[PDB]
């Protein structure tokens, strides 16, 4: 009896992503997370979205 997932995942866009999608035609996942990690100097991310 495999315990397979029951539902599709979902990947909402960030309100910060809406700006770089318009001015730069580009989206770097979790733009709010990279700002905090570069502020904190921490090199590693727990997960890549």
């Amino acid at each position: 009896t495999v315990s397979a997932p029951a539902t599709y995942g979902n990947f909402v866009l960030s309100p910060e992503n809406a700006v770089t999608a318009i001015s730069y035609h580009s989206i770097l996942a979790d733009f709010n997370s990279y700002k905090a990690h570069l502020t904190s100097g921490q090199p590693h991310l727990p997960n890549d979205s």
Partner: protein
């Protein structure tokens, strides 16, 4: 990202309506000036009369 376009369409409609109303006022001004320029004899004519 979609609400941005939903609002931008509304703003484009408002702009295309305000500018057309203003063009209408300026065209009314223009036409009332065109009317006088067709009913306005030159200076020397009126002076001779």
């Amino acid at each position: 990202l979609d609400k941005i376009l939903n609002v931008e369409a509304m703003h484009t409609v408002l702009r295309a309506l305000k500018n057309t109303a203003d063009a209408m006022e300026r065209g009314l001004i223009h036409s009332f000036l065109q009317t006088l320029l067709r009913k306005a004899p030159p200076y020397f004519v009126v002076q001779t009369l």
